[PDB]
């Protein structure tokens, strides 16, 4: 079928070669209420990632009674916990900002939230994790039906005109843009949306809604520690939180 | 605030205590084109899960030229590969079935597909992984924008009236319903949908579409092998596919 010459299109995004593995660990020894999303080019840093999530579990706090009976990541408490973490590390940035909108599509809200998180991460880091970051924020406001009973989402007060819920997600990043450190970015969402739960469960990005959202997050940089030498038992203990 | 007596509602689904961890492994030594979704109560069986996915990567085959340039899991080749896997194991079930619909919502198609996969797994196994199974099938037909460039989804022929694409997902199951074995269920989707790619990218469960879908899958039961004793280096090699 005669070999044609190369028509090199320089804007054609190539298919990813990244391997994605999702772990659902039933009945963990200790409960973890953070959705853990880990970016890693060297799997020897996975344990470190899981241990950072174990640490920031202690930074979750109850919401006010008016909101409901829910847990959310606290930036203030996050700072406290950061100091106690070993090996020692630094809080590069932190945010506690409200985001609102009126009668806009859910896609707009996802963007507004993305803007805040992209500010936290920075251009370089943002770009290296844009796919999972976009997906993670998307899954905060949509695809909630399948998530409704998960350990990282908490349903608060539910009126006829409003639904309150929290959503806890953590990003661990180790790649070319990080170098000799692994970044950790826990995010605690406190969301008020102008719809009944039943509608919220099946909200899409096309749907329109008014939002009042509080975003609490920080970026924690911890020097890399390989775990190749250690047995898998330690990783198992890390996942269970018994390490 | 006076302690009221217990109003025990026996149909109130409790919140999950399950810990969910997602691993994105950039630049793996060997490429893996299966979305790996692992259900595990004992993390000592993770390596086994990842090694089963490594094995069934060899069961992916190109689609016909008329469909496009895509890879999909082949049930026939899956059976061949199953025999070569060590430790030895058994193919409990296998399917190669077409599923179609006309002018129905995407939710209906998700159900039709679920029915087939639930048949493969069986009542007990199905129920133990219903959340991730429902989500996985949902993400096959929706939420494709964030997935569009991922390693497990391949875009074929794209006309003005039709989009062709494949979607490769693998479930590893180790829990109370499995006992002393781990089940492995690779699934190769070959999907023709009556819409342009741009529309397909932002398809929701509310959208209506005609579908022609081929589903190829099998259930592989391999006796459990704990990896607690082995170092994490082996797991790292398993993820890279160099083990
Ligand atoms: Ca990346
Ligand atoms: Ca389960």
B20 and A235 within 8 Å at the Cβ level: the answer is no
B40 vs A contacts (CB less than 8 Å): 23-26
Q: Is A3 helix (H, G, I), strand (E, B) or coil?
A: coil
Rounded to an integer, what distance in angstroms lies between the CA atom of residue A86 and that of residue A89?
A: 8
Q: B167: closest CA among B137, B130, B200?
A: B137
Rounded to an integer, what distance in angstroms lies between the CA atom of residue B168 and that of residue B194?
A: 20
Q: What is the maximal distance between C-alpha atoms in chain A?
A: 72
Residue A11 has a CB neighbour count (10 Å cut-off) of 4
Q: What is the resolution of this structure in A?
A: 1.9
Paired tokens of A158: 């539910």
Q: How far is the CA of A18 from the centre of ligand 1 (A)?
A: 8
A228 and B227 within 8 Å at the Cβ level: the answer is no
Q: B174: closest CA among B125, B239, B136?
A: B125
Q: How far is CA A214 from the centre of its chain?
A: 15
B235 and A235 within 8 Å at the Cβ level: the answer is yes
Rounded to an integer, what distance in angstroms lies between the CA atom of residue B45 and that of residue B183?
A: 11
* CA of A27, nearest ligand number: 2
Rounded to an integer, what distance in angstroms lies between the CA atom of residue A15 and that of residue A202?
A: 30
DSSP A203: -
DSSP A165: E
Rounded to an integer, what distance in angstroms lies between the CA atom of residue B178 and that of residue B182?
A: 6
B22 and A25 within 8 Å at the Cβ level: the answer is no
DSSP A14: P
Half-sphere exposure of B65 (CA within 13 A, CB side): 1
User: Which residues lie closer than 8 Å to A2 by C-beta, 6 or more apart?
Assistant: none
Q: Is A210 helix (H, G, I), strand (E, B) or coil?
A: strand
User: Which residues lie closer than 8 Å to B6 by C-beta, 6 or more apart?
Assistant: none
Name the phi and psi angles at B101, rounded to 5: -160, 160
Paired tokens of B151: 């390693």
User: Could you give the angle at the alpha carbon of B96 between the alpha carbons of B95 and B100, nearest 5°?
Assistant: 120
- Please give the helix or strand (H or E) that residue A167 lies within, else none: strand A163-174
User: Which residues lie closer than 8 Å to B69 by C-beta, 6 or more apart?
Assistant: B62, B63, B154, B156
- Please give the helix or strand (H or E) that residue A148 lies within, else none: none
Residue B28 has a CB neighbour count (10 Å cut-off) of 17
CA distances for B80 relative to A228, B50, B57, B58, B74, angstroms = 34, 19, 12, 10, 10
Select from B16, B20, B44 the Cβ nearest to the Cβ of A232: B44
* CA of A127, nearest ligand number: 1
Q: B116: closest CA among B187, B222, B211, B194?
A: B187
A44 and B15 within 8 Å at the Cβ level: the answer is no
Q: How many CB pairs under 8 A join A and B?
A: 217
For testing contact with chain B, the best of A16, A21, A234 (most B CBs within 10 A): A21
User: Which residues lie closer than 8 Å to B77 by C-beta, 6 or more apart?
Assistant: B58, B59, B60, B61
Q: What is the maximal distance between C-alpha atoms in chain B?
A: 72
Q: How far is the CA of B242 from the centre of ligand 1 (A)?
A: 21
> CA torsion sign, A185 to A191 to A195 to A200?
positive
Select from A16, A21, A233 the Cβ nearest to the Cβ of B50: A21
User: Which residues lie closer than 8 Å to A221 by C-beta, 6 or more apart?
Assistant: A89, A90, A92, A181, A182, A183, A184
Q: Which residue is associated with the tokens 């030229």?
A: B65
User: Which residues lie closer than 8 Å to B32 by C-beta, 6 or more apart?
Assistant: A19, B53, B54, B57, B151, B241
Domains of chain B are 32-232 (3.40.198.10)
For testing contact with chain A, the best of B14, B22, B153 (most A CBs within 10 A): B22
Q: How far is the CA of B12 from the centre of ligand 1 (A)?
A: 40
Q: Which residue is associated with the tokens 């329109």?
A: A208
Q: List the single residue in B with minimal CA-CA distance to A19.
A: B25
Q: How far is the CA of B131 from the centre of ligand 2 (A)?
A: 7
Select from B43, B150, B228 the Cβ nearest to the Cβ of A16: B150
A35 vs B contacts (CB less than 8 Å): 20, 22
A175 vs B contacts (CB less than 8 Å): 26
Q: B53: closest CA among B21, B80, B29, B78?
A: B78
> CA torsion sign, B178 to B213 to B216 to B153?
negative
User: Which residues lie closer than 8 Å to B2 by C-beta, 6 or more apart?
Assistant: none
Rounded to an integer, what distance in angstroms lies between the CA atom of residue B141 and that of residue B161?
A: 17
Q: How far is A231 from chain B (nearest CA, A)?
A: 4
Q: How far is the CA of A206 from the centre of ligand 1 (A)?
A: 27
Strands A35-40 and A163-174: parallel
Rounded to an integer, what distance in angstroms lies between the CA atom of residue B204 and that of residue B144?
A: 9
B38 and A20 within 8 Å at the Cβ level: the answer is no
User: Could you give the angle at the alpha carbon of B217 between the alpha carbons of A25 and B145, nearest 5°?
Assistant: 70
> CA torsion sign, B129 to B130 to B131 to B136?
positive
A21 and B19 within 8 Å at the Cβ level: the answer is no
User: Which residues lie closer than 8 Å to A233 by C-beta, 6 or more apart?
Assistant: B44, B228, B229
Q: B35: closest CA among B111, B105, B139, B127?
A: B139
Name the phi and psi angles at A85, rounded to 5: -75, 135
Q: Is A29 helix (H, G, I), strand (E, B) or coil?
A: coil
Q: What is the 3-state secondary structure (H, E, C) of chain B?
A: CCCCCCCCCCCCCCCCCCEEEEEEECCCCCCCCCEEEEEECCHHHHHHHHHHHHHHHHHEEECCCCCCCCEEECHHHHHHHHHHCCCCCEEEEEEEEEEEEEEEEHHHHHHHHHHHHHHHHCHHHHHCCHHHHHHHHHHHHCCCCCCCCCCCEEEEEECCCCEEEEEEEEEEEECCCCCCEEEEEEEEEEEEECCCHHHHHCCCCCCEEEEEEEEEEEEEEEECCCCCCCEHHHHHHHHHCCC
DSSP A91: E
Q: How far is CA A74 from the centre of its chain?
A: 14
User: Which residues lie closer than 8 Å to A52 by C-beta, 6 or more apart?
Assistant: A85, A170, A172, A182, A184, A220, A222
Select from A19, A131, A150 the Cβ nearest to the Cβ of B20: A150
Rounded to an integer, what distance in angstroms lies between the CA atom of residue A123 and that of residue A82?
A: 24
């Amino acid at each position: 079928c005669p070999l044609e010459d190369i028509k090199v299109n320089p804007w054609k995004t190539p298919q990813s070669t990244a391997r994605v593995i999702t772990l659902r660990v039933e009945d963990p020894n200790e409960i973890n209420n953070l959705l853990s999303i880990n970016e890693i080019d060297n799997p020897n840093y996975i344990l470190q990632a899981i241990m950072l999530a174990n640490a920031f579990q202690n930074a979750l706090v109850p919401t006010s009674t008016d909101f409901g009976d829910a847990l959310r990541f606290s930036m203030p408490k996050g700072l406290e916990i950061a100091n106690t973490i070993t090996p020692m590390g630094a809080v590069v940035s932190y945010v506690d900002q409200n985001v609102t909108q009126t009668n806009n599509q859910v896609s707009v809200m996802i963007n507004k939230v993305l803007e805040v998180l992209k500010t936290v991460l920075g251009v370089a880091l943002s770009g290296s994790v844009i796919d999972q970051l976009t997906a993670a924020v998307t899954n905060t406001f949509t695809n909630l039906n399948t998530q409704k009973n998960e350990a990282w989402i908490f349903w608060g007060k539910e009126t006829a005109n409003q639904t309150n819920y929290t959503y806890n997600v953590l990003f661990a990043i180790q790649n070319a843009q990080t170098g000799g450190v692994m970044y950790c970015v826990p995010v605690g969402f406190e969301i008020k949306v102008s719809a009944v739960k039943e509608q919220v469960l099946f909200f899409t990005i096309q749907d329109s809604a008014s939002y009042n959202v509080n975003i609490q997050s920080l970026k924690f940089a911890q020097p890399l520690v390989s775990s190749s030498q250690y047995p898998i038992a330690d990783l198992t203990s890390a996942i269970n939180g018994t390490l």
